Structure 1
Amino acid sequence: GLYKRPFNEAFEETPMLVAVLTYVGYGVLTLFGYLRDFLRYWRIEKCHHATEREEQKDFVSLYQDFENFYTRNLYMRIRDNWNRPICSVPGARVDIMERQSHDYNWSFKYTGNIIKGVINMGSYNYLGFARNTGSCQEAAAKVLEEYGAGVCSTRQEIGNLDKHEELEELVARFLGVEAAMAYGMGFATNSMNIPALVGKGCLILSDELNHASLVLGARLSGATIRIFKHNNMQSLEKLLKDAIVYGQPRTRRPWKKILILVEGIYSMEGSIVRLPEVIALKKKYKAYLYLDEAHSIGALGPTGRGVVEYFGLDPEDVDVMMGTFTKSFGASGGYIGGKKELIDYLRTHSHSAVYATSLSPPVVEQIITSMKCIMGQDGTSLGKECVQQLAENTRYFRRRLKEMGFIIYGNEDSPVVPLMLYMPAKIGAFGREMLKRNIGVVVVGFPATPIIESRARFCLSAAHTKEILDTALKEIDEVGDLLQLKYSRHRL
């Protein structure tokens, strides 16, 4: 496979002193956690937690204490950077209800005041469709008035509606594939459709950084799972060759099928899949392709059709194209697109098609209106300005942060910017300092990530004006000076 445009990405290595200090901090935390566990065991310090009821003291303990170690000693200390409630539409600016804790985050009390106008860098609205006033809101209100909220049956039963058929045909037109199906949850799409496609005797080749839904769907099916390195075509080719040559593990037999699970944009890493190479490899080795396109279906592409348009490829080349409406379109749900035979087999043999309640009418109406606006059916100039503004904002923000001396992961095109903190205390410090300056960010620590890289994720949007980006950048520069977060050696 060949690229029509340059493919630039950068993952700078950790400075050695930073790694040493990270290990020092983690060791200190582990030792003090052991001390606190010892104190709590002997009742020297009263434990502030719920316990089993007295009538069940002779039962086997429900949990294992050691599994909660990092929860009791690391997560609880910086627990206030997560689960922040909001009382407004998650737009470019959000309102956050203020809470305080008096027992070191073991319990939160709610103060009456409300933080207002916090710059939103944590929500997922890439194209800025999360609004309480607009055409989509009016369409959703009309459909809510007519159809009500929620359906009380299943698709194979009386619960199939006309709105669902309209949504499916419109989605099939939008993607360019022959047919598509819609489900009521992005997680459920994978978890309930991957077991249908493959089973015992097939091989699944999964990338190193797949979402939990893809992994759960692969585990639910009886197929064999092998993991290759993230965006490493050499590893993928080696695994494909070994799988085809050496056959099944115990009784050497040809594999019934080979399925490759990949993603469009990896949220935490910030990278874009090398789709031409994957397509070439699967054509050479006769494998099937499953493409999770949740983070790129609206963000990427000149017209916002996804990764396949970004690389200028043919949608007919990808066997299964899954996607989610939550990120870009501003409404819950998910979809799978492909050939007509695949869609018919899924309509017949899908767990969510038989046992799960279908979508809600207002949600499908909002999706329909948003996607019509994106493809330009309404005729208004909107739908192209959003994509252009998203691209400009991404380019400007990434360039400005890279020229400030920070370390940033991923491609130059992805609208997800992982800033690197590298130390356990700087996670909570960054979260609290950025909230103090009216910026809302998301911070990710050790057990989610590898040990040395802990990060903060910025999600850009088409609703972010230039002044908002400038304010956020100056505050980020001030905080980076305060916390010494400018580890980059190349430029500073």
Structure 2
Amino acid sequence: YTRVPLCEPEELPDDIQKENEYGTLDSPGHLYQVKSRHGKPLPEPVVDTPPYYISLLTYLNYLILIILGHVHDFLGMTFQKNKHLDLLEHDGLAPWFSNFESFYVRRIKMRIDDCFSRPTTGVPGRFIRCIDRISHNINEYFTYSGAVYPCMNLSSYNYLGFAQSKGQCTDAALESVDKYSIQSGGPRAQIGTTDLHIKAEKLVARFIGKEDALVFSMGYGTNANLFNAFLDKKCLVISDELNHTSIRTGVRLSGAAVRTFKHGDMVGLEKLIREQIVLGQPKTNRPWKKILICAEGLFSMEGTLCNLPKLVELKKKYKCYLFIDEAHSIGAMGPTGRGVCEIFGVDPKDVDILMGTFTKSFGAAGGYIAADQWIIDRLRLDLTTVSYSESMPAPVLAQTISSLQTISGEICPGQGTERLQRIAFNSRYLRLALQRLGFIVYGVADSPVIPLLLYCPSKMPAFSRMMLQRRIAVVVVAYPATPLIESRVRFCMSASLTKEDIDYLLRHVSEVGDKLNLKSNSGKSSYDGKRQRWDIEEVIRRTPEDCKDDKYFVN
């Protein structure tokens, strides 16, 4: 009962499983094509705020929580010691971790831990199967029973719906298993490399638009073991404050000086560049050997794009270098799917190094780096992962190659464009409907991530638990991951969902939010400068036609 059960697969006809994994389009009117911005710069984004009493209530709640937590910790660890044997010295040995460094997890998150780490089963498609569990004590241990129920999926990184067990990719993977075994001999330098690795590398290099590319087995290791190859203690790195942990770990391992600039502030970046060029190295005022700029394509937390032409202008005029990450932008953004370069029309030669990850949009595991020729030839000899780690297995390579060929159009014609149109329409429709209902939604008009703000801490577990009873799966984030005031729920849209599912979700979310008083719109979301408190039927009837027009989005 305590251990997680192993679920026997169910027997169903092919059509039912296909419908469960991938939906079937009802009308050809649910598709949208994405245009390219030639010479229109990105306007400064606008954010909306709630009234003051929300902030005051949040601060009071946090103050009470902190006071009570500290009082309980002190009294419990002073008046008794038998229960707290994992936080005290025993036979002259220090404990594993410290009291003060794990206060939040032990005292705040533990009471709502049931909303995290939810076991599942089966393919994560349109409907995801979940194992039922019963909470005991206060989220201490769980008891499992042999019962599974389906739920709607809004919490998985599946943008183009490639997570399927029936299709060309699965057949390619099975054929690869038949030909190449799952064994990997060793590092790519010794025995690991084969012809399929070269095929994948050339195909990726042709798809992206650069000259050469390399493949890896893990996205984290692509960043964590890259910067030490060509950086040292006499170089400067300028990075946005909202960057992934892998980049920070790589820069820390490299040893270069780090300076950060505020998100979406180019003037501060220019001032910092000028000051760092003039001043030089600390304690010596010698010039820097080189300067590198790091940025991300699409930020998952807010769904906002980076300003690429301005960065290109600065890097050209001040003679700097550029590095761009496209983990959430490849295969899902642009007229064809090349990335932010197609969105902005910027030639890919300007960017020095490009990076990406197969898992978010292709249904595999890996990463890549794309650059010029001589850079790749030097980095191949200078890298550490190539000659010290394992190699990429064959089924993953087959899945990635099949997905890339399908999206490019070589095989299975008329599928990639249809998927891209589906995801664009779904994202736009959901964002517009949510803004018309009266909520607060962040991001650009066409972004697969839709963050909805839920300010008061006590309103997060209630929303998460109420949505589960209505068979909708959601993911919620909070402090310290997000700022103290702003707590949000993240929506991940797919190309497998259908307008009926969106309507069902909209009705249930609207009623739950009306119950929990989550509607706080100050009129800056509307393009006509007025408050929007509509009805659900009117939204469902009018939004699908009017969502294609671009005049209804502030940004």
TM-score surpassing 0.5?
yes
Length-normalised TM-score, structure 1: 0.95
Post-superposition CA distance 1:120-159 (Å, at most 9, x none): 1110111111111111011011112221224130011111
What is the CA–CA distance in structure 1 between the aligned matches of 2:482 and 2:170, rounded to whole Å? 38
1:124 matched residue in structure 2? 157
Deviation at 1:43, TM superposition (A): 5.4
Residue identity opposite 2:145 in structure 1: T
Range with greater deviation from structure 2 (474-483 or 320-329): 474-483
1:51 matched residue in structure 2? 86
Q: Per the alignment, in what secondary structure is the counterpart of residue 456 of structure 1?
A: strand
Structural mapping, 1:128-207, within 5 Å: 128-207=161-240
2:74 matched residue in structure 1? 38
2:315 matched residue in structure 1? 282
Quick one: which of 309, 325, 344 aligns to 1:311?
344
Q: Is the 8 A contact 2:216 2:222 kept in 1?
A: yes
Structural mapping, 1:408-419, within 5 Å: 408-419=441-452
Deviation at 1:390, TM superposition (A): 0.8
Deviation at 1:379, TM superposition (A): 4.5
What is the CA–CA distance in structure 2 between the aligned matches of 1:466 and 1:90, rounded to whole Å? 19
1:4 matched residue in structure 2? 39
Q: Is the 8 A contact 2:237 2:259 kept in 1?
A: yes
What is the CA–CA distance in structure 2 between the aligned matches of 1:454 and 1:30, rounded to whole Å? 18
What is the CA–CA distance in structure 2 between the aligned matches of 1:405 and 1:330, rounded to whole Å? 35
2:149 matched residue in structure 1? 115
Q: Per the alignment, in what secondary structure is the counterpart of residue 84 of structure 1?
A: coil
What is the CA–CA distance in structure 2 between the aligned matches of 1:436 and 1:347, rounded to whole Å? 52
2:476 matched residue in structure 1? 443
Q: Is the 8 A contact 1:100 1:109 kept in 2?
A: yes
Deviation at 1:340, TM superposition (A): 1.1
What is the CA–CA distance in structure 1 between the aligned matches of 2:412 and 2:153, rounded to whole Å? 30
Q: Is the 8 A contact 2:38 2:344 kept in 1?
A: yes
1:231 matched residue in structure 2? 264
Residue identity opposite 1:429 in structure 2: A
Q: Is the 8 A contact 2:237 2:292 kept in 1?
A: yes
What is the CA–CA distance in structure 2 between the aligned matches of 1:194 and 1:386, rounded to whole Å? 36
Structural mapping, 1:329-340, within 5 Å: 329-340=362-373
Change (3 A) 1:481 1:172: same
Calculate percent identity across the aligned residue pairs. 48
Residue identity opposite 1:363 in structure 2: V
Q: Is the 8 A contact 1:7 1:411 kept in 2?
A: no
What is the CA–CA distance in structure 1 between the aligned matches of 2:148 and 2:444, rounded to whole Å? 37
2:63 corresponds to 1:63: no
2:16 matched residue in structure 1? none
Change (3 A) 1:437 1:50: farther
Q: Per the alignment, in what secondary structure is the counterpart of residue 411 of structure 1?
A: coil
Post-superposition CA distance 1:263-295 (Å, at most 9, x none): 110001211111111111111111111101000
Equivalenced residue count is 488
Post-superposition CA distance 1:310-345 (Å, at most 9, x none): 111101110000000010001010001111112112
2:414 corresponds to 1:402: no
Q: Is the 8 A contact 2:49 2:522 kept in 1?
A: no
Q: Per the alignment, in what secondary structure is the counterpart of residue 424 of structure 1?
A: coil
Length-normalised TM-score, structure 2: 0.85
Residue identity opposite 1:276 in structure 2: P
Deviation at 1:299, TM superposition (A): 1.6
Change (3 A) 1:3 1:430: farther
Q: Which runs of 5+ in 1 are unaligned?
A: none
Deviation at 1:32, TM superposition (A): 2.0
Q: Is the 8 A contact 2:155 2:475 kept in 1?
A: yes
What is the CA–CA distance in structure 2 between the aligned matches of 1:11 and 1:99, rounded to whole Å? 39
Residue identity opposite 2:202 in structure 1: E
Residue identity opposite 2:521 in structure 1: S
Deviation at 1:50, TM superposition (A): 7.5
Structure showing greater radius of gyration is 2
Structural mapping, 1:216-295, within 5 Å: 216-295=249-328
Deviation at 1:224, TM superposition (A): 0.6
Post-superposition CA distance 1:435-471 (Å, at most 9, x none): 1211111111111111111111101111111111111
Post-superposition CA distance 1:355-410 (Å, at most 9, x none): 11121110011000001001101052101101111111111111011111111111
Q: Which runs of 5+ in 2 are unaligned?
A: 1-36, 524-530, 533-555
Q: Per the alignment, in what secondary structure is the counterpart of residue 303 of structure 2?
A: coil
1:75 matched residue in structure 2? 109
Q: Is the 8 A contact 1:150 1:359 kept in 2?
A: no
Change (3 A) 1:270 1:46: farther
Q: Is the 8 A contact 1:39 1:45 kept in 2?
A: no
Quick one: which of 108, 112, 122 aligns to 1:88?
122
What is the CA–CA distance in structure 2 between the aligned matches of 1:476 and 1:164, rounded to whole Å? 46
2:329 matched residue in structure 1? 296
Q: Per the alignment, in what secondary structure is the counterpart of residue 346 of structure 2?
A: coil
1:25 matched residue in structure 2? 61
Q: Per the alignment, in what secondary structure is the counterpart of residue 94 of structure 1?
A: strand
Residue identity opposite 1:252 in structure 2: N
Range with greater deviation from structure 2 (107-116 or 456-465): 107-116
What value does the CA root-mean-square deviation take over the aligned residues? 1.8
Q: Per the alignment, in what secondary structure is the counterpart of residue 353 of structure 1?
A: coil
Residue identity opposite 2:468 in structure 1: L
Deviation at 1:38, TM superposition (A): 2.7
Q: Is the 8 A contact 1:151 1:360 kept in 2?
A: yes
Residue identity opposite 1:415 in structure 2: P
Q: Per the alignment, in what secondary structure is the counterpart of residue 337 of structure 1?
A: strand
Range with greater deviation from structure 2 (163-172 or 30-39): 30-39
Q: Is the 8 A contact 1:127 1:328 kept in 2?
A: yes
Change (3 A) 1:149 1:114: same
